[PDB]
Amino acid sequence: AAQTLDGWYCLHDFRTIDWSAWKTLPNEEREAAISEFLALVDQWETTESEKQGSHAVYTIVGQKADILFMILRPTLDELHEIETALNKTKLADYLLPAYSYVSVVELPYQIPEVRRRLYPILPKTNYICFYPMDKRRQGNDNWYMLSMEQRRELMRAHGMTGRKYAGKVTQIITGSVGLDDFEWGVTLFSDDALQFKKLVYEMRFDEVSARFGEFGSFFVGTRLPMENVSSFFHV
Amino acid sequence: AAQTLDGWYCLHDFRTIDWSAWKTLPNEEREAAISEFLALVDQWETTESEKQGSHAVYTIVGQKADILFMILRPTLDELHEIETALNKTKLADYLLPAYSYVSVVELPYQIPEVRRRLYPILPKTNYICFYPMDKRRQGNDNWYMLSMEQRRELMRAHGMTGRKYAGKVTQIITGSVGLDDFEWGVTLFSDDALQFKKLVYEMRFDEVSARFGEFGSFFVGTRLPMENVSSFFHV
Amino acid sequence: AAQTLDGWYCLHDFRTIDWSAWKTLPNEEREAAISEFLALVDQWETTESEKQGSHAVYTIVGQKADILFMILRPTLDELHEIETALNKTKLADYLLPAYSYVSVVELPYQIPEVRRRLYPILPKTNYICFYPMDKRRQGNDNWYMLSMEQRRELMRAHGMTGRKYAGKVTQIITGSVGLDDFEWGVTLFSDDALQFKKLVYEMRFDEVSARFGEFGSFFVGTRLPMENVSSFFHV
Amino acid sequence: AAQTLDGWYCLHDFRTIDWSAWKTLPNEEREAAISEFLALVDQWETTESEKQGSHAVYTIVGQKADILFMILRPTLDELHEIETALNKTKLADYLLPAYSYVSVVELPYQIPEVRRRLYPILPKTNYICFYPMDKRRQGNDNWYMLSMEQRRELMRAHGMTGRKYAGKVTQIITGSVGLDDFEWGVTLFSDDALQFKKLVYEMRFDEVSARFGEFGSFFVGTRLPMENVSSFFHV
Amino acid sequence: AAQTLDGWYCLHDFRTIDWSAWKTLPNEEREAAISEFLALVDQWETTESEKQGSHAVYTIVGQKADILFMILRPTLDELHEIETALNKTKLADYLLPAYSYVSVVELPYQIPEVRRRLYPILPKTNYICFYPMDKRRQGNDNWYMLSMEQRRELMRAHGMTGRKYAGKVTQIITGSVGLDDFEWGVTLFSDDALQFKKLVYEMRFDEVSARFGEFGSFFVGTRLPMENVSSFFHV
């Protein structure tokens, strides 16, 4: 348990858009609100350029959420700062809270492969899928009640399923034990959203998922380039 | 798990109607909003005609939802586009979110029987029933923990129950592993809504349903022809 | 499973009253809204007189709901029509959705017995109690996993407990498999509400309830005569 | 199961206060609304004096609710009447629904010790705690599946734990099988709120609680004398 | 069970900020509301100085809540008084309810180490994490069904894991049996939020957590100094 290495804190902030209200907001006002929010992301972009954090914005299909901001920042206080700056934008008046998830990129810190994984510049893939997950602690199938080695063996086949879908789906696992409601947040990024269905389903036929996986809601969405943001809020 | 073939993405967008607000909206305005939404579906109809997707609109009985749009589009980005165009209609100001489900028509692609099932023109039946379902991964009854063959045998009797209610109920199963909260979305279409009760109950006495079925909410509704849409929103 | 006989579809539409709003609505307007809703029920009453359906209105004690309309109509499309006509009344602007349940009176059809049970004129008893119920499909206690005969034997004692409380409580069971979220909707009607506590508690000490009963929310209420409707909405 | 004796119906009506709205309401209007609600309770007080029912008002700590009205009335129709008169007060416009629980004081009727317990004048103790509870019907630990005698023995030690905390905590158990969502509503009244923690925790180490207790939300609050009501709503 | 010693009642009042509304509130009005709330905390600060209670304000990351007031007061009536004074501030019009938890600092009273633990001046650490927890009473893993000694042994290793993370994370456990929905509220305070992930994860690999831990939502946040309050509400 002490073996996990810790990178960036990660907030997935999912919001819903109050389209009805947003439409009522005059055109020039709506335009400014987009500008304001764009300049905010422009700040985030500067942070990403300095390798001092990362974000992704995705519009989420379905009604669970409309848009996801995923922010990775070095400190949790930075995360809070971002959430709060977001919330105090005009646009955010129309971005109602939907679901949020705090977690920390988890896996020596100096090693480049670790460095990349711990401080990950989030992939600008067409699609993203997020779900929080737990390991079941339920009766016979109690992950925590397992042997270190049994756990290791369980995770061995899970590594294999992941590895099959590498070069298709990038997987960012964030640990959220004592940071949020589940134990891990799994974010996948693929240029093909079906690869998400493929990866997560194949994974379920691993003893680890089959037996121990308790998962939360799945959110999938499509990358919202910032050039596409004005368009998306056009009413 | 790799054997499943993948057709159209499917969004079931269930909304509730805010009748009270809708009534307050002036008559000519309400009329325009219907026109606007009708022209939207007219777009969808064109897509269906080009065999480039499919939709169904059903009004849902009960309070879980008032109306369901079920859209099947080739890409998930198309789905999102539709949801977002819907949401940015006047009418949608009054169609509050109720429940949504994303999933992919799942069952080589070239073969007509597959082609029809993968890219299904949704049946214009009097009634529809939707429920998302899982296979239980709970203790002894852990579907995922099952043998491939045991699974196959389980599904054998389920095929038989389905087949009894073929020519009554059309069944569109969409897999939603890593696309939404459950694993499958089951949509049934029948000209008789009782046949839904008949099919789903008989199915529950199959070991597969009995033992492994974890189901979500059931929604049933009646086809809303577009000629019937102006009528339905008449206040 | 194919042995069940099917009567009327049944909607239990529970609403809450927005008293605060209702009070703000001017007196003459409120009066008209009552008149309008009364004339609606007058329609329903005509349907009941023609033996072409049935309804009951009860005010529900507690905060789960304020009023229940229970409508039994031959077709589900009729049900929808009623819900939608209700919703498009003035009064319904103040009758917020609370909970709803669709189901079909279930128990050859030609026999005058069975006819009565399938097409039941709902009893004008002082009180009503509704709860949706399932049979547990959980581990060892999996009703569906049971023998037909074991089921029969289980239901034998349940019949006996029911029968003790016949001539006190009328029981309308509606099956809702593939019509709603649970498998049965149980509606009881008694002139004494305690008889509900008596019946449902005694039932729980039957193996069938004890072992297999998974129940939903219980709603109990008092019959709202239509002569009492103007009074009840007096503010 | 038929051995339980039945006293007053009991409604616990928990509300939340919409302070923000309440503040906006002019002073003289707020004053009248307090007066109106006070005169309502004055009615309830008259009922209590005639031994024809009982109430308690407590302000509830925490955000689950702000205030609880607990009303015990002979008939359920009386309960409804009270709820509805409450709801149609000005003050109630600001007392949003939070949670409610209907149940019947349960424990021959003529005997004074029964009479007192069945028709209980609720104790004017500094604090109250309410929680609804069930007996587990889950697998091995299925209360209902138990022997009458085993149940009796289970309840024997529970009686002992209760009895230790008698003269500290008054316990009003109301049965709510087929009246609400759980099977019992437990209301405790003590002049010391810690005695609630003491009683309910010690109880959990009884096989009955340990094994069979499924409990709902706990609400604790402080007695709101009616002389303290004007003060409490002062803004 | 009688061995636990009881200190201050503790309310964790988590609120969400209605930023949109707050922005609409004029500047001078918003300024006054901050002043008003600051003067309130100034009252709390005086209480803390007199050692007659304690508070902490933290802004919570994520959408579960925006801000947490944690108040420890000697009596529950004091707690209520505080909640109600908070709620009747201008600022609180914009601090919507999010989640609340009442509980009592639990661990002879005269002894300083007990005194400190029972009447704890909450640590002014950069971060806080709160989660309510239960001990599982589920089947085989029924804590309550355990031997006193087995429990003691279980808690022995839990003490060891805690002790490793002492001098990093301060842990305030509050018992809430019969005060709220779970049995314990765990509040951690660390200058490093990762130490929370570290402590709670390592704890899960203790039989006690692994087997018996049923936990609620986790909230983590950052200390909001009162000099930082004006800033935080700046719009």
Side-chain angles (χ1 to χ4, degrees):
Chain A
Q3 265 91 229
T4 81
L5 305 178
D6 280 301
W8 276 339
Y9 296 77
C10 175
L11 167 62
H12 286 82
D13 176 58
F14 289 100
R15 307 291 189 110
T16 285
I17 299 165
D18 188 8
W19 283 107
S20 43
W22 172 247
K23 307 195 236 135
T24 63
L25 185 65
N27 182 45
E28 41 59 39
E29 282 210 55
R30 264 181 339 238
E31 273 161 31
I34 284 319
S35 301
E36 194 206 358
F37 157 89
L38 276 195
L40 195 71
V41 173
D42 187 61
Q43 280 164 57
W44 307 356
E45 271 151 16
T46 298
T47 295
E48 199 170 32
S49 82
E50 290 160 336
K51 300 298 142 200
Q52 288 318 320
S54 186
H55 53 117
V57 186
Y58 281 78
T59 42
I60 293 316
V61 187
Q63 281 177 24
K64 330 233 282 229
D66 277 333
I67 184 160
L68 149 74
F69 309 92
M70 186 173 177
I71 323 280
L72 298 195
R73 284 297 191 282
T75 61
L76 190 50
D77 56 62
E78 268 168 271
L79 275 198
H80 173 258
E81 277 151 46
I82 282 214
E83 161 212 325
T84 303
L86 189 48
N87 282 341
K88 283 187 207 150
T89 51
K90 188 42 155 160
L91 181 72
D93 289 352
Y94 301 104
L95 303 183
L96 310 197
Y99 186 71
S100 64
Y101 198 69
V102 185
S103 45
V104 51
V105 180
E106 62 144 54
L107 234 52
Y109 289 76
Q110 223 59 238
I111 320 158
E113 49 89 2
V114 163
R115 274 276 152 187
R116 269 172 339 91
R117 285 193 18 220
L118 284 193
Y119 319 111
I121 281 50
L122 291 177
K124 280 176 190 61
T125 57
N126 291 342
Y127 295 96
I128 197 173
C129 168
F130 174 65
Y131 53 102
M133 90 173 275
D134 282 344
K135 285 298 203 305
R136 187 170 293 168
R137 286 180 308 96
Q138 186 79 269
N140 328 258
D141 315 312
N142 180 314
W143 173 254
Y144 286 98
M145 273 289 89
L146 278 214
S147 151
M148 184 214 254
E149 304 47 50
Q150 293 179 237
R151 272 201 303 250
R152 188 199 327 285
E153 290 342 302
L154 286 163
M155 287 313 295
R156 187 155 248 92
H158 195 83
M160 288 314 101
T161 303
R163 211 173 319 282
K164 273 176 261 169
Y165 289 102
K168 292 130 219 208
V169 180
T170 297
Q171 194 174 134
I172 306 302
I173 317 289
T174 59
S176 65
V177 180
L179 297 189
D180 218 308
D181 278 24
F182 278 78
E183 291 161 0
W184 291 276
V186 184
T187 301
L188 306 177
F189 288 84
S190 189
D191 279 345
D192 170 10
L194 202 53
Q195 288 316 302
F196 296 149
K197 153 109 147 26
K198 283 170 154 143
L199 163 67
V200 170
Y201 189 56
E202 232 184 69
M203 279 203 321
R204 212 155 277 204
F205 280 92
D206 291 347
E207 180 186 323
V208 63
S209 310
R211 249 188 92 188
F212 291 113
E214 301 280 46
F215 314 85
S217 317
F218 275 75
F219 301 72
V220 44
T222 63
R223 193 174 131 249
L224 183 53
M226 287 309 108
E227 324 90 46
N228 275 23
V229 162
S230 175
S231 304
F232 175 68
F233 276 107
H234 181 257
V235 289
Chain B
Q3 265 91 228
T4 152
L5 306 176
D6 280 301
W8 276 339
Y9 296 76
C10 175
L11 167 62
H12 286 82
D13 176 58
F14 289 99
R15 307 291 189 109
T16 49
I17 299 165
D18 188 8
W19 283 107
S20 43
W22 172 247
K23 307 195 237 135
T24 63
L25 185 65
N27 182 45
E28 61 302 330
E29 282 210 55
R30 264 181 339 238
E31 273 160 31
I34 284 319
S35 301
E36 193 206 358
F37 156 89
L38 276 195
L40 195 71
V41 173
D42 187 61
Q43 280 164 57
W44 307 357
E45 271 150 17
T46 298
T47 295
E48 199 170 32
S49 82
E50 290 159 336
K51 302 339 263 175
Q52 289 318 320
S54 186
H55 52 300
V57 186
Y58 281 78
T59 42
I60 292 317
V61 186
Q63 281 176 23
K64 331 231 281 229
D66 277 333
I67 183 160
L68 149 74
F69 309 92
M70 186 173 177
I71 310 101
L72 298 194
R73 284 297 191 281
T75 61
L76 190 51
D77 56 62
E78 268 168 271
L79 275 198
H80 171 70
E81 277 151 46
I82 282 214
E83 161 213 312
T84 303
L86 189 48
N87 282 341
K88 283 187 206 151
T89 51
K90 188 42 155 160
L91 182 72
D93 289 352
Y94 301 103
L95 303 183
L96 310 197
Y99 186 71
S100 64
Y101 198 69
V102 185
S103 44
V104 175
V105 181
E106 62 144 54
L107 228 28
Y109 288 75
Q110 262 33 259
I111 90 159
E113 148 91 16
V114 162
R115 203 90 181 160
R116 268 198 336 269
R117 286 194 299 157
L118 284 193
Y119 319 111
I121 305 326
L122 291 177
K124 282 181 232 328
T125 57
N126 291 342
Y127 295 96
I128 197 174
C129 169
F130 174 65
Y131 53 102
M133 90 173 276
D134 282 344
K135 285 297 203 306
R136 187 170 293 168
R137 285 180 308 96
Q138 186 79 269
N140 343 293
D141 315 312
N142 180 314
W143 173 254
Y144 286 98
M145 273 289 89
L146 277 214
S147 151
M148 184 213 255
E149 305 47 50
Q150 293 179 238
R151 272 201 303 250
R152 188 198 327 285
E153 290 342 301
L154 286 163
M155 287 312 295
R156 177 154 341 282
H158 196 268
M160 288 314 101
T161 302
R163 211 174 319 282
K164 274 173 92 285
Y165 289 102
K168 292 130 218 208
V169 180
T170 297
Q171 195 175 132
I172 306 302
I173 318 289
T174 59
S176 65
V177 180
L179 297 188
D180 218 308
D181 278 24
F182 279 79
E183 291 161 1
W184 291 275
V186 184
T187 301
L188 306 177
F189 288 84
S190 189
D191 279 345
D192 170 10
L194 202 53
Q195 288 316 302
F196 295 149
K197 154 109 148 30
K198 283 170 153 145
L199 163 67
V200 169
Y201 190 55
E202 233 184 69
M203 279 199 163
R204 211 155 276 205
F205 280 92
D206 291 346
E207 179 186 323
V208 63
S209 310
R211 249 187 92 188
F212 291 113
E214 299 223 319
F215 315 85
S217 318
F218 274 75
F219 301 72
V220 336
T222 63
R223 193 174 132 249
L224 183 53
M226 287 309 108
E227 324 90 46
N228 274 229
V229 162
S230 175
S231 305
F232 175 68
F233 276 107
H234 179 81
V235 289
Chain C
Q3 271 84 51
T4 151
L5 306 175
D6 280 301
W8 276 339
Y9 296 76
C10 175
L11 167 61
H12 286 83
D13 176 58
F14 289 99
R15 307 290 189 109
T16 285
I17 299 165
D18 188 8
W19 283 107
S20 43
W22 172 247
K23 307 195 236 135
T24 63
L25 185 65
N27 182 45
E28 60 301 331
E29 282 210 55
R30 263 182 339 238
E31 273 160 31
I34 284 319
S35 301
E36 194 206 358
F37 156 89
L38 276 195
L40 195 71
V41 173
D42 188 60
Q43 280 164 57
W44 307 356
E45 271 151 16
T46 298
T47 295
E48 199 170 33
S49 82
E50 290 159 336
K51 300 296 153 209
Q52 289 318 320
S54 186
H55 53 117
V57 186
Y58 281 78
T59 42
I60 292 317
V61 187
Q63 281 175 22
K64 330 231 281 230
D66 277 333
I67 183 160
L68 149 74
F69 309 92
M70 186 173 177
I71 323 280
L72 298 194
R73 284 297 191 282
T75 61
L76 190 50
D77 56 62
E78 268 168 271
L79 275 198
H80 174 258
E81 277 151 46
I82 281 213
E83 161 213 314
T84 303
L86 189 48
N87 282 341
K88 282 188 206 152
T89 51
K90 188 42 155 160
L91 181 72
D93 289 352
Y94 301 104
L95 303 182
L96 311 196
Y99 186 72
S100 64
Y101 198 69
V102 185
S103 44
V104 175
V105 180
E106 62 143 44
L107 235 51
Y109 289 71
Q110 262 31 260
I111 317 295
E113 281 35 50
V114 152
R115 202 88 196 168
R116 190 196 38 265
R117 294 185 313 264
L118 284 192
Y119 319 111
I121 305 327
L122 291 177
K124 284 114 188 59
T125 57
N126 291 342
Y127 295 96
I128 198 174
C129 169
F130 174 64
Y131 53 102
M133 90 174 275
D134 282 344
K135 285 298 203 306
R136 187 170 294 167
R137 285 180 307 96
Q138 256 279 92
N140 343 293
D141 315 312
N142 180 314
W143 173 254
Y144 286 98
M145 274 320 282
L146 278 214
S147 151
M148 186 250 197
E149 304 48 49
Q150 293 179 238
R151 273 201 303 250
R152 188 204 324 283
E153 290 342 302
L154 286 164
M155 287 312 295
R156 183 164 243 91
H158 195 82
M160 287 315 101
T161 206
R163 212 173 319 282
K164 274 173 92 285
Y165 289 102
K168 292 130 219 208
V169 180
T170 297
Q171 194 175 132
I172 306 302
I173 318 289
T174 59
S176 65
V177 180
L179 297 188
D180 218 308
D181 278 25
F182 278 79
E183 291 162 1
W184 291 276
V186 184
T187 301
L188 306 177
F189 288 84
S190 189
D191 278 345
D192 170 10
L194 201 53
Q195 288 316 302
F196 295 150
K197 153 112 172 330
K198 283 170 152 145
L199 163 67
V200 170
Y201 189 56
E202 232 183 70
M203 279 200 164
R204 212 155 276 204
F205 280 92
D206 291 346
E207 180 186 323
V208 63
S209 309
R211 249 187 92 189
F212 291 113
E214 241 69 13
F215 314 85
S217 318
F218 274 75
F219 301 72
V220 336
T222 63
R223 193 174 132 248
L224 183 54
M226 287 309 108
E227 324 90 46
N228 275 23
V229 162
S230 175
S231 150
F232 175 68
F233 276 107
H234 179 82
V235 289
Chain D
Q3 273 84 234
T4 81
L5 306 177
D6 280 301
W8 276 339
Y9 296 77
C10 175
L11 167 62
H12 286 83
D13 176 58
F14 289 99
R15 307 291 189 109
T16 285
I17 300 165
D18 188 8
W19 283 107
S20 43
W22 172 248
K23 307 195 235 137
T24 63
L25 185 65
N27 182 45
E28 60 301 331
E29 282 210 55
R30 264 181 339 238
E31 273 160 31
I34 284 319
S35 301
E36 194 205 359
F37 156 89
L38 276 195
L40 195 70
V41 173
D42 187 60
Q43 280 164 57
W44 307 356
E45 271 151 16
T46 298
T47 295
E48 199 170 32
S49 82
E50 290 159 337
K51 299 296 154 205
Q52 289 318 320
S54 186
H55 53 117
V57 186
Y58 281 78
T59 42
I60 292 317
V61 187
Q63 280 176 20
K64 330 231 281 229
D66 277 333
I67 183 160
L68 149 74
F69 309 92
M70 186 173 177
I71 323 280
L72 298 194
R73 284 297 191 282
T75 61
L76 190 50
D77 56 62
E78 268 168 271
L79 275 198
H80 171 70
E81 277 151 46
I82 282 213
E83 161 213 312
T84 302
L86 189 49
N87 282 341
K88 283 188 207 150
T89 51
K90 188 42 155 160
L91 181 72
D93 289 352
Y94 301 104
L95 303 183
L96 310 197
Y99 186 71
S100 64
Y101 198 69
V102 185
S103 44
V104 51
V105 180
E106 62 143 43
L107 235 50
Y109 288 75
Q110 218 28 261
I111 90 162
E113 313 90 351
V114 162
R115 273 276 154 196
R116 268 199 335 270
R117 285 193 15 207
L118 284 193
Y119 319 111
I121 305 326
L122 291 177
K124 282 182 233 328
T125 57
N126 291 342
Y127 295 96
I128 198 174
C129 169
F130 174 64
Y131 53 102
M133 90 174 275
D134 282 344
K135 285 298 203 306
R136 188 170 293 168
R137 285 180 308 96
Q138 256 278 92
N140 343 293
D141 315 312
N142 180 314
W143 173 254
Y144 286 98
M145 231 56 273
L146 278 214
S147 152
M148 187 267 268
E149 300 56 34
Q150 293 179 237
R151 273 201 303 250
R152 256 215 326 283
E153 290 343 303
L154 286 163
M155 287 312 295
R156 182 143 350 270
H158 195 84
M160 288 314 101
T161 302
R163 211 173 319 282
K164 274 173 92 284
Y165 289 102
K168 292 130 218 208
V169 180
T170 297
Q171 194 174 134
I172 306 302
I173 317 289
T174 59
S176 65
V177 181
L179 298 189
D180 218 308
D181 278 25
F182 278 79
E183 291 162 1
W184 291 276
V186 184
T187 301
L188 306 177
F189 288 84
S190 189
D191 279 345
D192 170 10
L194 202 52
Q195 288 316 302
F196 295 149
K197 153 110 147 28
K198 283 170 149 210
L199 163 67
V200 170
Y201 188 56
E202 232 184 69
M203 279 202 322
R204 211 154 278 204
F205 280 92
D206 291 346
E207 180 186 323
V208 63
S209 310
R211 249 188 92 189
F212 291 113
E214 301 280 22
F215 314 85
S217 318
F218 275 75
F219 301 72
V220 44
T222 63
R223 193 174 131 248
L224 182 54
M226 287 309 108
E227 40 259 295
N228 275 24
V229 162
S230 175
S231 320
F232 175 68
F233 276 107
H234 180 257
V235 289
Chain E
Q3 266 91 228
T4 151
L5 305 177
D6 280 301
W8 276 339
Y9 296 77
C10 175
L11 167 62
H12 286 82
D13 176 58
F14 288 99
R15 307 291 251 252
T16 285
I17 299 165
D18 188 8
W19 283 107
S20 43
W22 172 248
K23 307 195 235 137
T24 63
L25 185 65
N27 182 45
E28 60 301 331
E29 282 210 55
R30 263 182 339 238
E31 273 160 31
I34 284 319
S35 301
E36 194 205 358
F37 157 89
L38 276 195
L40 195 71
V41 173
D42 187 61
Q43 279 164 56
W44 307 356
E45 271 151 16
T46 298
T47 295
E48 199 170 32
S49 82
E50 290 159 336
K51 299 296 154 205
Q52 289 318 320
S54 186
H55 53 117
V57 186
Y58 281 78
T59 42
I60 292 317
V61 187
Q63 281 174 24
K64 309 154 79 135
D66 277 333
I67 184 159
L68 149 74
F69 309 92
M70 186 173 177
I71 323 280
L72 298 195
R73 284 297 191 282
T75 61
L76 190 51
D77 56 62
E78 268 168 271
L79 275 198
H80 174 258
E81 277 151 46
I82 282 214
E83 161 213 314
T84 302
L86 190 48
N87 282 342
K88 283 188 208 149
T89 51
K90 188 42 155 160
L91 181 72
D93 289 352
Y94 301 104
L95 303 183
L96 310 198
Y99 186 71
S100 64
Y101 198 69
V102 185
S103 45
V104 175
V105 180
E106 62 143 44
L107 235 52
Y109 288 75
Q110 270 333 99
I111 320 295
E113 53 267 24
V114 162
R115 203 90 197 167
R116 270 197 342 268
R117 285 193 17 206
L118 284 193
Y119 319 111
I121 305 327
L122 291 177
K124 282 182 233 328
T125 57
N126 291 342
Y127 295 96
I128 197 173
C129 169
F130 174 64
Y131 53 102
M133 244 203 111
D134 282 344
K135 285 298 203 307
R136 187 170 293 167
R137 286 180 308 96
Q138 186 79 269
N140 343 293
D141 315 312
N142 180 314
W143 173 254
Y144 286 98
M145 273 289 89
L146 278 215
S147 136
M148 183 215 254
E149 305 57 45
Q150 294 180 236
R151 272 200 303 250
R152 188 199 328 285
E153 290 343 302
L154 287 163
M155 286 312 294
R156 177 104 8 94
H158 195 268
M160 288 314 101
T161 302
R163 211 173 319 282
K164 274 173 92 284
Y165 289 102
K168 292 130 220 208
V169 180
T170 297
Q171 194 175 134
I172 306 302
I173 317 289
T174 59
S176 65
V177 180
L179 298 188
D180 218 308
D181 277 25
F182 278 78
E183 291 162 1
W184 291 276
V186 184
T187 301
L188 306 177
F189 288 84
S190 189
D191 279 345
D192 170 10
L194 218 130
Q195 288 316 301
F196 296 149
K197 153 109 150 16
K198 283 171 147 154
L199 163 67
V200 170
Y201 189 56
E202 233 184 69
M203 279 202 322
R204 211 154 278 204
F205 280 92
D206 291 346
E207 180 186 323
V208 63
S209 310
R211 249 187 92 189
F212 291 113
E214 299 223 319
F215 314 86
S217 318
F218 275 74
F219 301 72
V220 336
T222 63
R223 193 174 131 249
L224 182 53
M226 287 309 108
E227 54 272 15
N228 275 23
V229 162
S230 175
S231 151
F232 175 68
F233 276 107
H234 179 82
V235 289

